[PDB]
Every structure is written in C-alpha cells, then in structure tokens.
Amino acid sequence: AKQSMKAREVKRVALADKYFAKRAELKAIISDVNASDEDRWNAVLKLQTLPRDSSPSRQRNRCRQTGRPHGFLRKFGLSRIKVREAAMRGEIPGLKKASW
Amino acid sequence: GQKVHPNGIRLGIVKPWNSTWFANTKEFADNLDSDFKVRQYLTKELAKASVSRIVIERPAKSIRVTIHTARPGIVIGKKGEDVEKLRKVVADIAGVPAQINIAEVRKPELDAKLVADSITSQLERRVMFRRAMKRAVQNAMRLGAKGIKVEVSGRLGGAEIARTEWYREGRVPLHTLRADIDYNTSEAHTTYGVIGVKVWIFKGEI
Amino acid sequence: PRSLKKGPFIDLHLLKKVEKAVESGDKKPLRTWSRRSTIFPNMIGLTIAVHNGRQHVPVFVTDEMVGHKLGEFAPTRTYRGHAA
Amino acid sequence: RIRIRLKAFDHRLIDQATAEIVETAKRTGAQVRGPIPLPTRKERFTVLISPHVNKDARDQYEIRTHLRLVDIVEPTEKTVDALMRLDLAAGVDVQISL
Amino acid sequence: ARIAGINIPDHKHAVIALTSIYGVGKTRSKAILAAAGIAEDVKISELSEGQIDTLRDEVAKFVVEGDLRREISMSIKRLMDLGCYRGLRHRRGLPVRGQRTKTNARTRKGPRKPI
Amino acid sequence: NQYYGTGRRKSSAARVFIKPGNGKIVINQRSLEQYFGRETARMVVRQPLELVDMVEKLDLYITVKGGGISGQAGAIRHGITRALMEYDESLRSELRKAGFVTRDARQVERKKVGLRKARRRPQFSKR
Amino acid sequence: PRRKILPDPKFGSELLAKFVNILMVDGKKSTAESIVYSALETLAQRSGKSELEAFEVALENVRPVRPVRRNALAMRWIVEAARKRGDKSMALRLANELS
Amino acid sequence: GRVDRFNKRFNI
RNA sequence: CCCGCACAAGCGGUGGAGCAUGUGGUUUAAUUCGAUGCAACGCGAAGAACCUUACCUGGUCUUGACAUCCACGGAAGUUUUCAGAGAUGAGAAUGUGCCUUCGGGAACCGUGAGACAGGUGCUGCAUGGCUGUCGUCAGCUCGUGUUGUGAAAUGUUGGGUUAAGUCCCGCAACGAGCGCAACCCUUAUCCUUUGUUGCCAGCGGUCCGGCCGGGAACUCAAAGGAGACUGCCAGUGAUAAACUGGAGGAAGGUGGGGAUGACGUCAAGUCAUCAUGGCCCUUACGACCAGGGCUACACACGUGCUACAAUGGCGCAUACAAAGAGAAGCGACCUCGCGAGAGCAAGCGGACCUCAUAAAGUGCGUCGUAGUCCGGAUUGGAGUCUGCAACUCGACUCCAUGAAGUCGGAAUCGCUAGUAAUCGUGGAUCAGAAUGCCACGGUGAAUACGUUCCCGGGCC
Ligand SMILES: CN(C)[C@@H]1C(O)=C(C(N)=O)C(=O)[C@@]2(O)C(O)=C3C(=O)c4c(cc5ccc(CN6CC(F)C6)cc5c4O)C[C@H]3C[C@@H]12
Ligand SMILES: [K+]
Ligand SMILES: [K+]
Ligand SMILES: [K+]
Ligand SMILES: [K+]
Ligand SMILES: [K+]
Ligand SMILES: [K+]
Ligand SMILES: [K+]
Ligand SMILES: [K+]
Ligand SMILES: [K+]
Ligand SMILES: [K+]
Ligand SMILES: [Mg+2]
Ligand SMILES: [Mg+2]
Ligand SMILES: [Mg+2]
Ligand SMILES: [Mg+2]
Ligand SMILES: [Mg+2]
Ligand SMILES: [Mg+2]
Ligand SMILES: [Mg+2]
Ligand SMILES: [Mg+2]
Ligand SMILES: [Mg+2]
Ligand SMILES: [Mg+2]
Ligand SMILES: [Mg+2]
Ligand SMILES: [Mg+2]
Ligand SMILES: [Mg+2]
Ligand SMILES: [Mg+2]
Ligand SMILES: [Mg+2]
Ligand SMILES: [Mg+2]
Ligand SMILES: [Mg+2]
Ligand SMILES: [Mg+2]
Ligand SMILES: [Mg+2]
Ligand SMILES: [Mg+2]
Ligand SMILES: [Mg+2]
Ligand SMILES: [Mg+2]
Ligand SMILES: [Mg+2]
Ligand SMILES: [Mg+2]
Ligand SMILES: [Mg+2]
Ligand SMILES: [Mg+2]
Ligand SMILES: [Mg+2]
Ligand SMILES: [Mg+2]
Ligand SMILES: [Mg+2]
Ligand SMILES: [Mg+2]
Ligand SMILES: [Mg+2]
Ligand SMILES: [Mg+2]
C-alpha cells in the first residue's frame, strides 16, 4: 500500500481513541429510551460535528507488514501472503500445514 | 511445478519453530509484529556477523532472543558491550524485559542461511555465479553433508534474459519428511536487479 | 430507513443554512453537498442546489418532498439510451 | 482446591509442564487429581497461495491448543509456595484458580 | 359467494377463498374469519347468507379491490410527478429497489429486445 | 450379572447392556417402538437377536448418542452383537457370517478446496 | 472400467429392496419404502395373490440380457412408466402400472 | 399528507 | 500395447424461466486497475454506502500525508468558539510538567531552507519471490564403462508383473540421483494411563433433573502403546516377481481420506501484496477534503440460487447430529413487540456459559392436479437494526401484491460409495452487508458388459 494510505489508518486509529468516550456518551443519549426529544436531537447534531475519522467503522484492517487492505487475518494481523511466508519459516508459533 | 517449503512441511516432524511462545488471540498479532521488528532490527545490526537464525521465546512477560551466529565474538563484543546495546534496543521495541543469548554455529558451510548469504555477498561483489555455487557445494560435502543443492535465479552475469542455474551433490530427498533438510534463501541486489539464491542441505534422516 | 427512535437525519451545516435563509427571507439557491439530508417542512419554497457529483442541481422544495432525502432529486448517472 | 489449567501449542511441552506440577505437589505432600486431558482446540486457516488469482490454489494451516487440568486437593502450607515459585517452560500458559 | 364486488369460490375453504379479494392475503383472511367467528376450513358453499353478510362487514374494514388499486396507482403517480429517483425508475420501467440492471431485471424490462 | 458391548456407526456410539430376561428393549429410557419410528431401524436393532434366536431370552438396556437414526440403529446392532459374544463366544462365527461383527468404517468424506463437496466438481464450460 | 443390497424390512427380499432404491430420490428411502408398501398392498388385495408373488407377475411381463440386468431394466421401466402416469399419488400410479 | 406524516412520526 | 468418470453403463445437472454473481459490450464526468481456450469470467476481492478507493467533479497543499538531518520559537496537551461541504482558516481559554551537572537536554508541537521524501506511474518481454498448468502423469537424468568418424546410443530396451522406471528375470552394462513407495496428519478396532467442566453400570438417596451422595465401570476426552506384513493357507506362475481365492481379523492386499507436485513446458500469471534493474512525474503522475463512481443497461457469455409441485405445499405434534466461534465479544432468563427487534440483565476467555429450533424425518390433518393452498419475481405501504450517514447503494421484518415458470433445442457438465443426490449446521472476511468461499454432520442411491469410438496421457 502507498505510504499515504498507511498514514490515513494511523490517523483514524488515533482519532477513534481520542473521541471514543465522547462518541459513546452521545450515542448512549441518542439510544436512551427515556431521553428527551431535545436531548436526543442535540446529541444527533453533536455526533456529526466530530471528525468522521473518529468513527471506528472508518478503519480498514491492513496487513501490518505490507499495508494490504484485502486478505487480512485478524489472528495474525497479516495478509494471507505474509502469513504464508511467516508460517513456512516457523515464525508463527504452533502453526503448521493441516490435513484431516 | 511449485514445491512446498522444505522447512514449513517439516515443522513439528523434524524441524523446530523459530518462535516459541503461547498467546491468546488478544496478544497473538501484537507478538508476531514485535517478533518481526526484533528480527528486522537484529538482521540489519548483525549483517556482518553471520547470523543464521533468530529464535524468540516469550517467558512470562519478558522476551528471550537466541541469536545463532558463526561469529559469537563480533555479536558479543568487548565484555558484552555490543550484546548489551542489542539487549536494550530489543527491550525497547518489544516493550518488555529482554534477554539475548548467543548460540555458536560451529560449521557455517553446513548452515543453509549462511551458505545462501555467502553466495549473495559474492554475487554483489561480481564473483562469477558458477564459481560461488561450485565452492558452496564442495565445502558442504567436504564438511560431511549427505547432500546439497544450490539454485541461483535472475540476470546471471548481468544477462538480459534471466535464467535459473542449479548444482547438486549427494542426496537431497525432499519428499522424505524425516529427512533433515536445512533450507534457506537470500537475495543479491545487483546493478541489474535481484538474483535469488536457494540452498538445501541434507544432513541425514531423523 | 433510519430508525424512528433516532429521528430524521439532517446535516447541521444545512439545518443552519436553511434557518438563516428562512429568517432572512433570502431566495438565492442554497448550495449543498448534503444529499443525505432529509427534507424538512421549513425547506418548503426554498431552492436547494444539490450536488450530483459534478454540478449543483436546483431542487425547488415542495410539500410532497418532505421526508425524502435531497439526493433523491439530483440523479448522479447520465443515461440517454444505448440506441441513440 | 488449587485448579491449574495449562495451555500450549505442543503436547510434549504441556506433558513436561504437568509432570513438573504433579511432582511439585507430590513433593510438598499435597493430594493431586492427576492431569485431565481436556479437548484440544483445532483452529484452522485457509489462505490463497498465489499473489494474484488462482482461487483453487490454497494452503490449509492449523494451530492446535492442548489443554490440561490439574486439581490440588488439600493444598498444604508450602504447596502453593512451590507452585507460584515455578518457571515452567516458555510456551506453556499457566492459569491458577482458588 | 359475492363479497367486495367479486365472486369468491364456493368450493374452496373460506381462508383460501377470501384471498381471491385484491388486498386480502392469508394473514388478513385468517383475521377476517377469526373476527366473523367462522372456521378457516369451512367451504364458502356451506356458509349461510347471514355468515356471508358478517364476512362483508369484516372485509369493509380494509381497503380492497378498486379502492386499493386507486391508492396504489396514486402512490406511483405521486413518485413519478415528484421526479424523485424512484419516480424516474417507474417512468423508465426499470427496477426501483436498487437491483442490478447489467443482467436480469427481466420482470421490469419484459422479454429481451434484440440489438 | 450383565454383558456389555460398545457399538459404533458413522458418528453414533451405543452402550448395550444385556441380561437374561423376557425380550424387553429400552433405548435412552424409551421403548424400541418409541425410539425408532422407522421399521428398517427396528429391524436392524433386532437382527442379531433374531439371528441367534434369543429375542425373548434377553433384556437389553441401551444408551446411544451421536449421528442419526440409521447411524444409531447400526451402532446399536454392533453393540448388541458384541454383547452377545461376551454372553456366548460360540455365537461369533454366525454373527461374523451375517456381517454384524464388522465395524462399518464408512464415514463422511471431507469437503475439499476447489470442489463443491468431497468429489462434486464445479461445472466446466469448454466454449 | 479399463482394469450387495440388503433385504427389505417388511418381506425379506433383495429384489424389492432394489426396487425401493430405484424408486428412491434424494436419499429419501423411508419415503420410497412407504410408496412401495402402499402400492404392493393395493396390488395384493386386487388380485388376491400376495405382494411378493404379485411383484413377480409384473416383472416377468416387463423383463427384456444377463438375468441381473433383466430385473434392473424391468424395475427401471416400471418406475419410469409409473412416474409418467397421471393418477393421484405415486403409490396408486405404481399399483396401476404393476397391475 | 407528507408534512403531517413528517411532524407526527418525529419531534424536536 | 496400456491408463484416467476419457468413453460406455448409470444417476443428477447446465442449456429454457425468475433472481444472485462475474465477464464482455455499450453507456458514462467516472463507470479504478488486474485475470482471457483447457489453465480468465461467485477469479486478485476472506465481504465497494462513507471509509476501503487506486477512478470522476470540484475545493485545496507544496520539504510535503509518510522519514532522517539543521536552525529558530515554543512543554505536552486539553477545553472551546466562529467561518467553511470539509480539507482548512482565524481565534479565545487553560495548562507550563520531565532530565536537573540545576549545564541543559528528552520529548513532542510549530515555522524556515534543501539534501530529500512521495508515486496502486510504465516495463511480468529487464527481475526476485510467489502461483497456475501438463499431472501425483511415471517419468527425468548422471558417473564410470562400452559402442559409433560423429550428432548420439546403452543403462532406461526386452520376457513377466504393478497404482508406479513397482518388482522379478534376462541383458555391455555396472551403479547412482531426482521422482514412485515409505517416514507425516486424519479415520476404522483394541489396550494402558488420567477422570473434570465430560461420564452414570452398580449402590444409597431423590423434588425424577447425573439432580444428590458417591462410583471410575461405560460413552468420551488425549497422551502412550498394540494392530495389516501378501504374514498364514491354497491354486495359478517361469523352482521368480506377482496374481486369484480362502482363513482369521475392526480392518486385506496402497483398508478409507489428506498433505506431499520430479527434470521441465507455456517469454503462462502477478512491477497493484511485497521486493527490485531501468525509465518516467516532482507547486504534481505526490498530498488533503466533500460529493459522485466502481451498483450504469438496447444487449451477449460464464458460474450459481430458487422453482415449475402431490416422492409435494401448508398446519399441528414430535425424534436423532457433527463441526465451529466468542470480550469494543457470544449474550441466557424475564418483560414488551404480529415480527425484524427492544428493555432489563445472568453466565462465559469456555468439555462448565452463550451463539443454538438441526433440517430433511416421523405421526395426524388438510389441499386434489389447478398456473393451484405450486412458484415467490416485481411493486405499493409500514417498520427494525448497524452505522457520523443506508437518496444514489444495506440487511432484515410486517401487511398488501402475486411475474416468468407445466422439467427446458442443438449441445454440454459432475460423479464409481458413505460417492452422487438431497437436508440442514458452522467459520473466515466483517460496524452492517453471502445464493460465493471454506468447513461440518444427517439421509443415502444407480451403474460399470466392456475399450471400438471421443478427450488427455504413458511405453515400444
Ligand atoms: C493472453 N493472450 C493475449 C496471449 C496468450 O494467450 C499467451 C499464450 N501463450 O497462450 C501468451 O503468451 C500471452 O499471455 C503473453 O504472455 C504474451 C506476452 O507476454 C507478450 C507477447 C508479445 C510481445 C511483443 C512485444 C513485447 C515487447 N514490449 C512491448 C514493447 F513496447 C516492449 C512483449 C510481448 C509480450 O510480453 C505475446 C503475448 C500473448 C499473450
Ligand atoms: K443498480
Ligand atoms: K516471475
Ligand atoms: K554414459
Ligand atoms: K460511493
Ligand atoms: K448465486
Ligand atoms: K401431506
Ligand atoms: K400461489
Ligand atoms: K445504501
Ligand atoms: K436447465
Ligand atoms: K459483518
Ligand atoms: Mg511502498
Ligand atoms: Mg470496514
Ligand atoms: Mg472453543
Ligand atoms: Mg388476495
Ligand atoms: Mg405476504
Ligand atoms: Mg444490491
Ligand atoms: Mg454432506
Ligand atoms: Mg456417458
Ligand atoms: Mg438459465
Ligand atoms: Mg473490469
Ligand atoms: Mg497481463
Ligand atoms: Mg498494471
Ligand atoms: Mg493463452
Ligand atoms: Mg470457484
Ligand atoms: Mg467510495
Ligand atoms: Mg461550520
Ligand atoms: Mg517506481
Ligand atoms: Mg512471464
Ligand atoms: Mg525415458
Ligand atoms: Mg524407482
Ligand atoms: Mg510419495
Ligand atoms: Mg507474458
Ligand atoms: Mg519496477
Ligand atoms: Mg472520498
Ligand atoms: Mg465490481
Ligand atoms: Mg406457497
Ligand atoms: Mg448461528
Ligand atoms: Mg405462463
Ligand atoms: Mg403440473
Ligand atoms: Mg475415480
Ligand atoms: Mg448447502
Ligand atoms: Mg510405464
């Protein structure tokens, strides 16, 4: 992946962490059953003023070695390609070729 | 056709892992990434020190790294000054207490990684590929390898058309899972691009 | 559609722009990229120029449009037939 | 009761680690309900092996997590001392429950 | 026999027969019959004129037949007059609910028109 | 004083306890008729007893887990057969001849990469 | 290439078990069994001859060839014929084809 | 239609 | 002369319909790029609303979004306002630490300059690495010797035999290497060990629930062993290798399945995973943002799903799985809602808790061969949930609607057994978004005379 694309992900992770508590607060009001209509409305308006990149759903899992945005495996934090290279060198503990 | 990785297929049969730690999913990816960065750091720092293998254990919270080297003296340095520099950097990148152990490779000519790295060093110095390959094969067989194969692929001697050349002596029975095949690779970055080296060393069954 | 419990979505920047146009009685088209905003009753009689990807399409808001998204009135794809 | 759960990716290592625990208990003069082999988890991964296309070309990998339960009935005075003062082999996760 | 200006089949079970009305499906049919106090499996032929008159009263609580056809027509005309995206899809005779048109869409487009 | 046999078939495993009795069969605390609706399955369960002529000489107490109706009926037959050979070893050759001593080792074949099933390949267009 | 059935439950015949298998679709043997037995009961009552014997009557008239294959084709033709019929159920379609 | 549809299913 | 679901024998499909999906084409501001006979076309993509994103339109930046170096200002930061679609501008508050040699640095922010950074830009016909393919086909070679002026040959051919250059026998060859086989995983039988979170035969108790005391038997868990060798027997065979049959045995002749892919072939695929020679761009081919597009639709092709019904649909009742996942997670019970769901809130990093009704099945009833009580496309109305946000373009629910379709021309595909066919179940990716993919059990066939023919291949 381009250097810029890897830097966008770092920015998104950092903003999501910076605003996690505030976003959770606002969304708790918007979801709150016994919240007032005005308080719900104000929360809806406030939530959209926060940076879009503070939403966790903006993050794309990328291979931690290459930045590849497809073929990710969460267990390893790597794409399918880098998993295989690491696996065959014995660098992934316990992982071996499976037959059954 | 394409061949299975000789090391990979023998893991847990005749071949150990290079990382031995348990982790749950929560820490697994982070441990892999810290291991990657540790090996990246040490491989660069000890490029002149004939490192064959970097084994990583994670006892408790700490990290224990075993560096297999043909040259323990250069890695350790004077009164362990150099190995202490490594240990402090490894501790920082791992973010946990670090131990560094040194393991001597007594026979570098029987170590696939060191043989591969020896060939790629020579190719970058514009040694004739055929000479480098032939000597690698001759040395291994002299030091008691049951067999050795060396493959070199790319723009050999700066030719426009890339080709693969290989030499074998003795036995290299890659379908025998109990065969101790030491396999490793290296890349020479030449003026005409990448030449790839593969080395297989057979040291007997079981 | 958006859960009724959350209310209808409108972009805050558009809401404020609409409020100012209504209070002023200003009749110049409101330029917006907020295709996702719901049309509200107080937008009736305004011209909202809605982005379609390359131009702002003037949408004269009527009472029947209330509750629709603005993007519904600004088609994004150009098609005039294959055999033409 | 001390319950000890051991996990490892290799059964030889986990069996060494359980053998250490039982001997530590049976030296401290503690009753041990001997190693129970609990079900091995087999986590599987299927990956495409080509950099591009060739969808039918895959590798299938597995991590086996081995699991052992040891139960220490009537923990003596230095029983708990000898178990909490034990560095089992790297690669074995040890969870002690009271 | 005759309900909402249509003839309901006499030989069928009442629960099936009532679905002949445009605007009555299986759920509304069951609800109509539950309200009228008529069993689902009674044949329409086997009902008395008093029982049929109560069925007419229950059906009268729903918009059906020509009243429903005109509501649906009005709803589609409204979209087309608005000139919203859905209205444009109705005008052009293409899928209105986001379906692919590169292939398929034959229910809306009709049979294939050779180049 | 009872005679035991384990039986298995597909993913089923049956525990069969035999004693002298009057032809009672209990499977998982239910009668044979109640446990298996299928008469094929009832036949399979009763095959070894009918073959050795001990249908009302014996009471069977059976538990069975895993697999389906046919798997369980086959596991039970295998378990009964083994319990009968504990009861009387001389029955072996007759039970062996009927094919009941064999553990039917046929299992579901795994699905494979690039196939729809174990063997079913995706359709091929030549042109 | 270049280089056994079990008997049916109700009667004890490899011939009828094969017939059930030929009738069966989609591994639904219990369904097929119920059809074959329902059909044979209809067929037995009509003539007064037994199910198994009445089955042999129908086969002998249809059989076209090695003796095993003669039965196979006959059963395959009965089932194919019965499915082509336009009677209410398969059991009746089969009984009407056998009779 | 739509304005009273709107004002009854929602509120500030 | 041989082999392979290659044909034949069979069973079920595709080709017709609707829909899903990929591709071509056409269209477009853009419909990003790549894959192309088998071996591209549910392929890279294990999951495009925004993001992803590579494309378009417009708004913006220029040592830079991402590094190191130097200098000069600042602790970091946090709260907060206005303008703006946002990028980004202006502000306004507040805070003034940690190293202390109390010399100063270390962070970590700004700004200036330029060495540089940056490029999913080009070349897969400059490359590495990785992959497909012939093909898991039985081949491919070498040393030494010998033969030929020599290219070469022999071995490796031949007589038997095998799944196999498998093995035996013969033989100017004698040996060897890479392949075959074996060693590895899994499945079928048994034994030993351990016995909870799993187990319940016997026993005591019991509210009847392995529920309780207990028990360690059994199922099971998972470590270690045993077991299959053509070993035994017979007949055939060249006093052979082997073959055919039999016994015993859970298993019989490679028991079943997997992993494992020789020398090479196609300048095959991939410079867009990554790496990399060369070339090219550098106040732009780099970088930031909002909105759009990748979802377009006269059309053509490929792969699928759902059907066309009665071996079925519907209703009610009621059996029997396996494998797997789970902490920004799986979420019970209870209450509310027709429902999607909501509220409340246990338990569980799990043989314990949760996902989590298996469905086909079976019993009873009903429909009665109809475009139907078949089908479930399409469309209207009303909702739910995820998510800053579902207009373009989500999934799901409810009410209504109720299309084509009556078993599909030429042709063509898969499959030899727990297979095909059919029935559900789980997982990866993932906020949400499978008819795809990967995996799991349930039920469970037909047929194979044969090798003339068609396709691919082997040996002479
Ligand atoms: C895909 N198909 C169009 C062709 C194909 O099917 C084959 C095949 N063997 O079946 C190919 O070989 C192919 O895929 C392919 O790889 C090709 C090439 O690689 C190729 C070809 C021709 C070329 C001519 C010139 C050059 C030099 N470059 C262009 C100039 F600016 C510098 C390169 C070529 C090249 O790489 C033939 C194609 C055929 C393909
Ligand atoms: K569309
Ligand atoms: K290549
Ligand atoms: K020679
Ligand atoms: K978009
Ligand atoms: K599909
Ligand atoms: K019925
Ligand atoms: K219908
Ligand atoms: K959408
Ligand atoms: K068809
Ligand atoms: K998801
Ligand atoms: Mg890069
Ligand atoms: Mg995402
Ligand atoms: Mg688990
Ligand atoms: Mg109706
Ligand atoms: Mg409906
Ligand atoms: Mg769609
Ligand atoms: Mg199956
Ligand atoms: Mg054929
Ligand atoms: Mg079609
Ligand atoms: Mg394309
Ligand atoms: Mg190409
Ligand atoms: Mg390209
Ligand atoms: Mg080609
Ligand atoms: Mg596919
Ligand atoms: Mg986008
Ligand atoms: Mg603003
Ligand atoms: Mg470049
Ligand atoms: Mg190429
Ligand atoms: Mg040859
Ligand atoms: Mg050989
Ligand atoms: Mg092999
Ligand atoms: Mg090419
Ligand atoms: Mg390049
Ligand atoms: Mg964008
Ligand atoms: Mg697409
Ligand atoms: Mg229906
Ligand atoms: Mg589920
Ligand atoms: Mg029609
Ligand atoms: Mg019909
Ligand atoms: Mg076969
Ligand atoms: Mg399925
Ligand atoms: Mg041969």
Author numbering:
A (entry chain N): 2 to 101
B (entry chain C): 2 to 207
C (entry chain S): 2 to 85
D (entry chain J): 5 to 102
E (entry chain M): 2 to 116
F (entry chain I): 4 to 130
G (entry chain G): 2 to 4, 11 to 71, 91 to 125
H (entry chain 4): 55 to 66
The article reads:
The ribosome is a major target for clinically used antibiotics, but multidrug resistant pathogenic bacteria are making our current arsenal of antimicrobials obsolete. Here we present cryo-electron-microscopy structures of 17 distinct compounds from six different antibiotic classes bound to the bacterial ribosome at resolutions ranging from 1.6 to 2.2 Å. The improved resolution enables a precise description of antibiotic–ribosome interactions, encompassing solvent networks that mediate multiple additional interactions between the drugs and their target. To ensure homogeneity of the antibiotic–ribosome complexes, which is important for obtaining high resolution, we used highly purified in vitro reassociated Escherichia coli 70S ribosomes, to which each cocktail of antibiotics was added.
For the tetracycline family, we included one pentacycline that bears an additional ring E, as well as two clinically approved third generation glycylcyclines, eravacycline and omadacycline, which were developed in response to increasing tetracycline resistance, and differ from tetracycline by having extensions on the C9 position. Similarly, the structure of the pentacycline on the SSU head at 1.9 Å revealed high structural conservation with tetracycline, eravacycline and omadacycline, with expanded stacking interaction between rings D and E and C1054 of the 16S rRNA. However, despite conserved scaffolds, some variability is observed within the conformation around ring A, which influences how the Mg2 is coordinated. For omadacycline and pentacycline, the conformation allows direct coordination of Mg2 by the phosphate-oxygen(s) of G966, whereas for tetracycline and eravacycline, the Mg2–G966 coordination occurs indirectly via water molecules. While the densities for the core-scaffold of each antibiotic were very well resolved and could be modeled unambiguously, flexibility was evident for parts of some molecules: for example, the C9-moieties of omadacycline, eravacycline and the pentacycline, ring III of apramycin, the β-lysine of capreomycin and the C14-moieties of tiamulin and retapamulin.
